[PDB]
Write a protein that binds this ligand. Structure first.
Ligand SMILES: Nc1ncnc2c1ncn2[C@@H]1O[C@H](COP(=O)(O)OP(=O)(O)O)[C@@H](O)[C@H]1O
Ligand SMILES: Nc1ncnc2c1ncn2[C@@H]1O[C@H](COP(=O)(O)OP(=O)(O)O)[C@@H](O)[C@H]1O
Ligand SMILES: Nc1ncnc2c1ncn2[C@@H]1O[C@H](COP(=O)(O)OP(=O)(O)O)[C@@H](O)[C@H]1O
Ligand SMILES: [Mg+2]
Ligand SMILES: [Mg+2]
Ligand SMILES: [Mg+2]
Ligand SMILES: [Zn+2]
Lengths: 689, 595, 595
DNA sequence: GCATGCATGCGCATGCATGCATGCAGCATGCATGCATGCATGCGCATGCATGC
């Protein structure tokens, strides 16, 4: 016959029973975990449920090891994820406990409406039962009652979202299984055979659309019969109804006109994102490709441009959208549906103390000598350069912003310029810092210019509104911007960095745009003398091209020269040759700290805000007076990169605050200012050889 | 229903496969590999048209002239043999001489329709690999049954068939609702490409001709734009050329395209496709024997461009560049370069361009460029384009295509700062960074560079220091691993000798050299040794603390260059570790270059 | 494509056939016979619905209520079993109890549509057996190849299918002409009949109801008009009841009919179907044992109509008539009669009608008639009718239906000359001749006759000679082999005894007797013997040359009658030759009848 | 034997199922065209860069 039938090794009743038992039975190594979660959900302190597959695997293995049979719910979900969502939703709805807290005036309108709907359901059921019993024409009575009455379906009474998360490699390895759902893949490797599965993709985000309401069920109200009509929608477009469909209007001769009711509708928060290949995954001589991701519900706003992430999702198809003339059969377009996001570098803003972080941080601080121990751990394969490594660490930590009132503001970030002879690993240090930073961006001269920095006006494909796409500076907001070949930049770009490093903003006034952008970022610049090697026979300011004011506005400026020395050359050569012969550093008395723990400690330190007192103020003013008195004589002899100015005092203050924060103290101390002055002094040591 | 001629052709092709015994064992090997490893191999093999001609001329002509009647029988015979020999359907590909059926997009006319053809050209644009729906599966809630349906279209079969446009089911036969099973459905890939006549053969001043091609399943992503390609397939016509219905329009004709079934990339000079040769056991024995002699480096060095006189050190340097060093990546994520770079400055009749062209011709993957010929985006791939799908992206440039290969630059001094700054990053970090409106990416550009330049005063002057004679940024000169200076001085004996040599010309082989280079670069990766460590340390210290006037400055780049040269010489030696001899050769060559 | 439910049902029916082993050996026997005898047997088997119910009730109800989904699987299972067990498709027939699915054309309503039914009725009109074209074969002259095509219609399967109206091919695909091969094509028979409610069960004074039936292949010529038939089939509906297109007419409904799959003729009184029984080895042993007892004739004669008193000689005569003699045909083409005829004349309360009705009830094929009930054409079948094909033909009458059987005539003396002249030919030549407009034929009417008549004066009178009491033409009397005269004379003892016998009644079995007569009439054919020849010669001479006044004349018909009685008594004895005892018994019986 | 009445066959009117065409009118449908949309194109201006003086 037409539409034959086929037999598969899948039974849904057994799986549903197993789901119910799992939801009501699981215990982690207190009552059931998921039952407590449901109690919170009913009490209205939660919105999302996360189902982990490691729990399911543990449940299955526990059932097996003691003999009783169990099905491979893990494999079933992995292969046909999209179908189990409804099974889980129904299983949960069959078990949701009652609310233990009354509904008050400080609750959500959504919850109010849901409660009203449930009470109304109970009212019709009771009324129908009473009416039927009155006739004198209990399971049969109940059954006829459900059969002869209309209700609000469960989906219009649910209040929570449900998501899955993949199987951990550790758990699969311990249980002797192969975690397919948690093997990272590139957009290159995702082919058609993977459709309908739960898979993990490793990539870098490039574009994210704004959050907008996506409709799932439209609601209309009929004034004639007082009914509510619900129309499902699962397409990119739909058609509104005109005439009633309720039973009364259907039977009657005069039908009422439907109207639209936004509040009763069922909306979803929807975003679309574009993910791109990583460099190391692209084959030789090819261009990276992209992929489309959809985010629905409470998982929105979890992705921002420039993030390197692992996204778990269900791979689903979509209707074809190319030209008709090139269509050959039933071609389809693909996308990923998001379920779980894992960042490769945890943002500072999301910091929160906890036993696991506490033990590691206390271990590190107990080990002692935190300052030097961290400083030596930045790019440990580069020899020497301890002072610049310390300065870079202080730049990473940052200072303290100050809100002085009356609308004014004082920056709290540190700006560093390295200026050196060729072949001293400036680019290596730049790249290492950009990698260690959680929002570090990297740039090189003519590669990016104009709208490459700042932002440009474009039109969103998803929505029909105009938007601004940011450049490197906006992408590096609340982070580090590393610039190579600083002196080769164009005048417009130089002015852009000028204004950013002045007041953390960028003003644009051009055809079709009149606005200001926020660029709360730190600057780490690299530069090379104007004649290649430094010429001691010429003044420092004539040895460089950038404007003296631009040099001055930097908090820290280092000069790096290559003076041959038969002693230190031996040490450097031994270091480099050891680094090549192995893949590790040579020192054995020092153990470097990994970037994860470094980020942990820096994030913790950023929570502090030390303050300044009178003794330190007196010391600072005396030091500033002495330094300002001295610098004038040097500048007169044309042997200084710049005269001392109040920006120097502000830089000293910021460095002292950063050192205090690193020490993890609310109180600043004289030794911090001592170290800051030591650094700012040694900044120009090589100029006096 | 069964057809007598169809069965007869099946039997005849079965006899062919029986008389020839390579394809049976090939199929057995494919099945054995798949069974053992469960990666999976496709169910396809290749046949020799020459063998077919020798066996049965009638069947040969039948396949060549009427594939629609002769291929499906052979495919069925192959499938039957595979299913019989084993403890999806299989497919066929063709190699051999096509005689008059080897054409080009310009010489492909309507008289070749429905006949198997082989076209050569350059890929101009590919399409996005999309899945195609074949079989759909559904589940019934009210009954607990699984239903399915099948689909097909015009391009999946050679013989015309009566359309059967089955609809997508949403209800059961009884009226119940249906649920879709994406994981239990079946999808197949599909791509479309365009091929154009090569620019080395197309008429000049005349617009080019192009032809479409459709690829399916396991032939879906075997090429990229800009490749030289040879495609063997069936040239077919589809649809009705406006005949059906009135269709008053008469201008349009019949749609045509190729149901491609074999695709081959071809190597060419100044192209992104690398050359690769198959190595035989005789080749391996010969190369391994040759490696054991003591003057192998000298022999290989002299083998290069024997038509030119002298320049032994430059020949050795070119060989070292070809072999290359080794690059290191640390767990932290740091990258350490392993390529080599060469610059030559000399008098204007010293065969600089000749050596440049020789390296272009012999290198497996090389791209040639001149000073002002390519500028701006043409070098860094900084151009942006977009299709009708709305997405913008990049298309590769000189150095980007040159990844893992060689770039020859002629008239080097003629460049500008806008692109010298750009090439700084390529020569040191081996990456390219782009940031335009809506694009922020990074492209790997791991390539080596050979360049030649002229002195400022026409002829090299010995009365001035090298700075005035070269006049190039010191930072740039630092990035080049080796710099050579060559001057022609008149001398009766040398002039005599070059005269006899040139007159001789005017009245080891390269292929074996290429095989040697391929094996050496693919198989062996040596490691450092304490002896070499000490030798390099001593030599670098001496150079840094010597007062002699040099042509180039000294940095840590010199130490890294010494290490790279030692490793490359070890690679030439085919040893697993660098040695004192290799270190000394590297030091001696560097000293000769500098002094 | 394959269907899971179809496969499950096939496997279940396979299990049924495995558990029940009779059908397997039946199929093996059919194949054995068809192989050995090359007449060919068809591929059809009968299944028991009772066994199906006992095995699987759900499957039983499935077949009963939805045959369209359950039968084809069973047919496929049977075909598979046959093709597996052997060293066309096969078909099924159903017997057993149909419960509420046994109906009649009056009680057959729309609620039974698509359900397996069993109807009973009388065949009213059969149709002409025509061949149906299935597969056509053609030959191409220009190319020397044979093509073919297949055809189908709506009535060849239970399940609906998408129409595929292929056309008759006259040309090749290339344009060549084609020549048909009538000898290599394939044709199948086809017939349509109509069944009506029985006349003994339909309400009196009401018009009857009828239903059509379609038969195909080997069920094509199993019945004739006027027969009692039970047909088991599938009640089905075809076409669209004017729904498609406008078709403004609403009076007509859906066409319906039965795709019959089993046909059974049934025996009834005064009907053209002969009754037959199946003889078991127990039956044969009992009959053969009984054969050896000396008083077998006496016991058999007494067994008939034990409710009546006396008439022993008449019972003997009726038994002799039932057994019958032998008819002879010579190489010349002459025919010699072998039947017997009986006439009874008696007083009006002598159970004549009772004996006559007993013979009607017991004889395998008997037809009953009254004096004036049937007249003219009704006896000789001389009626002429025609269909819409335009041809005229004959439809059989009483004696024509009575071929090889018995005719009971009651109130014989009320007939007329016009039909007594007709019956003369039937009694003597055993043939009927008709010569009407466009009809000149001759029908075989080999039947025996038993008749009863009343004396002229109400009661037989002994004071007058037999002629005045009988008053029938001497020619007619000569044709009756035996004539009996029976009178009731009052007598105290006889009246007493008949009284007790009748009162006893008012307060060997027949089936075994019927089996006995069937076996005797089918198996034994005796021959004449010189002893009987001499005895009959002497008896005939004496009778012809005696002076006693007889009740009937004497001719050579009397000698032939002696022969027939002797042969029939030998048949009763189951001896292969007549004997002196049989001759003497025949002579004694005839002498008693005449005197 | 002789006269009548009933059945029976012959002849004369007529209605009635099949099967076909023809003029006609109705109804789905292709076809003219009316349009917004998104895209690529060239088309000058501002200007950073290289060159000559
Ligand atoms: N102090 C050092 N220790 C180890 N390697 C170094 C050091 N200084 C320079 N190098 C090497 O020299 C190269 C300098 O390249 P780069 O990082 O671009 O610096 P620059 O821009 O000054 O040339 C690097 O590849 C690095 O490995
Ligand atoms: N060392 C040499 N031995 C033989 N021939 C040479 C040598 N140097 C130059 N020539 C000849 O002189 C010509 C130089 O051409 P070209 O390579 O264009 O000059 P250049 O490279 O110096 O610009 C070549 O055709 C080559 O045959
Ligand atoms: N010899 C007999 N033995 C028993 N019953 C007889 C006998 N003769 C007549 N009868 C009874 O008398 C009735 C005669 O009915 P019927 O056969 O119509 O009379 P007839 O045959 O003389 O015309 C029957 O019902 C039968 O039972
Ligand atoms: Mg650098
Ligand atoms: Mg040249
Ligand atoms: Mg009677
Ligand atoms: Zn309504």
């Amino acid at each position: 016959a037409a539409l034959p039938s086929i037999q598969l090794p899948v039974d849904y009743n057994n799986l549903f029973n197993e789901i119910t038992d799992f939801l009501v039975t699981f215990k982690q190594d207190k009552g059931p975990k998921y039952m407590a979660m449901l109690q919170k959900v009913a009490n209205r302190e939660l919105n999302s449920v996360i189902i982990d597959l490691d729990d399911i695997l543990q449940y299955q293995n526990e059932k097996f090891l003691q003999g009783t049979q169990a099905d491979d719910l893990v494999s079933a979900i992995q292969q046909n994820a999209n179908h189990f969502t409804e099974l889980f939703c129904r299983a949960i709805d069959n078990n949701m406990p009652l609310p233990t807290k009354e509904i008050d005036y400080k609750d959500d309108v959504l919850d109010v409406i849901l409660n009203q709907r449930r009470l109304r359901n109970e009212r019709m059921l009771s009324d129908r039962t009473n009416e039927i019993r009155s006739e004198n024409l209990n399971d049969a009575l109940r059954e006829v009652v459900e059969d002869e009455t209309e209700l609000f379906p469960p989906n219009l009474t649910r209040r929570y979202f449900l998501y899955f998360k993949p199987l951990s490699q550790n758990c699969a390895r311990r249980y002797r299984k192969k975690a397919i759902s948690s093997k990272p893949l590139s957009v290159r490797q995702i082919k058609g055979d993977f459709l309908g599965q739960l898979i993990t993709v490793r990539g870098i985000i490039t574009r994210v659309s704004d959050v907008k309401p996506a409709v799932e069920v439209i609601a209309y109200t009929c004034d004639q019969c007082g009914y509510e009509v619900f129309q499902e929608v699962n397409s990119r477009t739909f058609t509104p109804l005109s005439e009633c469909t309720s039973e009364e209007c259907s039977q009657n001769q005069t039908k009422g006109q439907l109207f639209m009711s936004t509040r009763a509708s069922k909306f979803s928060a929807f975003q679309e994102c574009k993910i791109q290949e990583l460099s190391q995954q692209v084959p030789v001589g090819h261009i990276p490709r992209s992929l489309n991701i959809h985010v629905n519900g409470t998982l929105v706003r979890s992705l921002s441009p420039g993030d390197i992430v692992d996204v778990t999702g269900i791979f689903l198809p979509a209707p074809y959208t190319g030209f008709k003339a090139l269509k050959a059969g039933l071609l389809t377009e693909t996308y990923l549906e998001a379920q779980f996001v894992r960042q490769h570098k945890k943002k500072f803003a999301s910091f929160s103390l906890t036993s696991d972080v506490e033990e590691r941080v206390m271990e590190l601080i107990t080990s002692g000598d935190v300052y030097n121990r961290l400083a030596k751990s930045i790019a440990p394969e580069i020899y020497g350069n301890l002072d610049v490594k310390k300065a870079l660490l202080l730049l990473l930590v940052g200072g303290v912003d100050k809100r002085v009132g009356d609308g004014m503001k004082i920056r709290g970030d540190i700006n560093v310029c390295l200026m050196g002879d060729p072949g001293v690993a400036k680019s290596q240090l730049l790249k290492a810092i950009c990698k260690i930073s959680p929002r570090g961006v990297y740039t090189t001269g003519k590669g990016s210019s104009g709208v490459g920095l700042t932002a440009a006006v474009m039109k969103d494909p998803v929505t029909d509104e105009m938007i601004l796409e940011g450049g490197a500076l906006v992408l590096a907001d609340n982070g580090i911007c590393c610039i190579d070949e600083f002196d080769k930049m164009d005048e417009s770009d130089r002015t852009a960095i000028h204004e950013v490093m002045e007041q953390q903003t960028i003003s644009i006034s051009k055809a079709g745009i009149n606005t200001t952008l926020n660029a709360r970022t730190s600057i780490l610049a690299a530069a090379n003398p104007l004649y290649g090697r430094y010429n001691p026979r010429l003044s420092p300011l004539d040895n460089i091209n950038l404007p003296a004011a631009l040099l001055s506005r930097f908090d820290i400026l280092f000069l790096m020269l290559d003076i041959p020395s038969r002693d230190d050359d031996e040490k450097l050569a031994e270091h480099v040759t050891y680094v090549h012969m192995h893949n590790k550093q040579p020192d054995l008395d020092f153990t470097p700290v990994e970037p994860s723990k470094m980020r942990e400690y820096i994030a913790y330190a950023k929570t502090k805000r030390p303050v300044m007192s009178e003794a330190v103020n007196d010391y600072v003013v005396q030091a500033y007076i002495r330094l300002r008195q001295d610098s004038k004589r040097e500048m007169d002899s044309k042997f200084s990169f710049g005269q001392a100015t109040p920006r120097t005092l502000l830089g000293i203050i910021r460095l002292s605050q950063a050192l205090a924060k690193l020490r993890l103290a609310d109180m600043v101390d004289i030794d911090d200012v001592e170290e800051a002055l030591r650094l700012v002094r040694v900044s120009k040591e090589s100029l006096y050889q | 229903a069964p057809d007598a001629v169809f069965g007869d052709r099946v039997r005849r092709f079965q006899e062919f496969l029986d008389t020839f015994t390579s394809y049976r064992d090939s199929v057995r090997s494919i099945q054995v590999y798949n069974s053992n490893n469960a990666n999976i191999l496709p169910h396809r093999i290749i046949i020799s048209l020459d063998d077919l001609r020798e066996f049965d001329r009638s069947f040969w002509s039948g396949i060549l002239v009427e594939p629609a009647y002769f291929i499906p029988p052979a495919e069925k015979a192959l499938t039957d043999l595979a299913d019989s020999m084993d403890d999806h359907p299989w497919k066929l590909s063709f190699k051999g001489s096509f005689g008059a059926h080897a054409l080009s997009p310009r010489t492909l006319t309507a008289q070749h329709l429905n006949k198997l053809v082989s076209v050569e050209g350059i890929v101009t644009k590919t399409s996005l690999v999309r899945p195609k729906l074949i079989r759909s599966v559904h589940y019934a809630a009210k009954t607990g049954r699984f239903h399915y349906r099948d689909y097909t279209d015009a391009t999946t079969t050679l013989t015309t068939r009566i359309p059967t446009p089955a609809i997508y089911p949403t209800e059961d036969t009884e009226g119940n609702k249906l649920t879709t099973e994406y994981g239990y459905s079946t999808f197949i890939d599909h791509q479309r490409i365009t091929v154009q006549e090569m620019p080395e053969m197309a008429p000049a001043g005349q617009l080019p001709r192009s032809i479409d091609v459709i690829l399916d399943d396991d032939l879906v992503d075997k090429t990229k734009p800009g490749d030289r390609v040879n495609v063997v397939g069936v040239f077919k016509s589809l649809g009705a050329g406006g005949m059906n219905q009135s269709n008053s329009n008469t201008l349009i004709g019949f749609k045509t395209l190729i149901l491609g079934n074999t695709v081959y990339p071809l190597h060419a000079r100044s192209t992104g496709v690398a050359a690769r040769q198959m190595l035989t056991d005789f080749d391996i024995r010969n190369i391994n024997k040759l490696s054991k002699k003591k003057d192998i480096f000298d022999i290989l060095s002299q083998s290069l461009a024997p038509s030119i006189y002298g320049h032994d050190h430059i020949k050795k340097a070119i060989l070292l560049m070809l072999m290359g060093g080794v690059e290191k990546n640390l767990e932290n994520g740091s990258h350490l370069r392993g390529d080599i770079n060469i610059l030559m400055v000399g008098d204007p009749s010293t065969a600089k361009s000749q050596l440049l062209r020789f390296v272009l011709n012999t290198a497996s993957l090389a791209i040639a460029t001149t000073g002002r010929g390519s500028s701006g985006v043409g070098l860094t791939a900084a151009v942006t384009t977009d299709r009708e799908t709305g997405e913008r992206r990049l298309e590769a440039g000189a150095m980007v295509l040159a990844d893992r290969g060689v770039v020859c630059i002629d008239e080097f001094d003629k460049m500008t700062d806008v692109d010298r700054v750009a090439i700084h990053e390529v020569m040191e970090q081996q990456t390219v960074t782009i940031a335009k409106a809506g694009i922020h990416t990074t492209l790997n550009a791991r390539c080596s560079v050979i360049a030649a330049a002229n002195p400022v005063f026409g002829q090299y002057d010995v009365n001035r220091d090298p700075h005035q004679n070269i006049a190039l940024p010191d930072s740039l000169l630092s990035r080049f691993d080796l710099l050579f200076v060559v001057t022609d001085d008149i001398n009766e004996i040398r002039d005599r000798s070059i005269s006899e040599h040139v007159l001789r010309t005017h009245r080891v082989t390269i292929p074996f050299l290429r095989k040697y280079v391929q094996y050496a670069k693919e198989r062996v990766i040596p490691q450092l040794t304490q002896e070499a460590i000490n030798v390099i340390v001593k030599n670098y210290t001496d150079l840094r603390n010597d007062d002699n006037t040099k042509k180039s400055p000294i940095t840590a780049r010199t130490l890294e260059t010494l290490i790279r040269l030692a490793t490359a010489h070890a690679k030439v030696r085919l040893s697993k570790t660098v040695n004192k001899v290799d270190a000394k050769v590297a030091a001696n060559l560097l000293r000769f270059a500098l002094l």
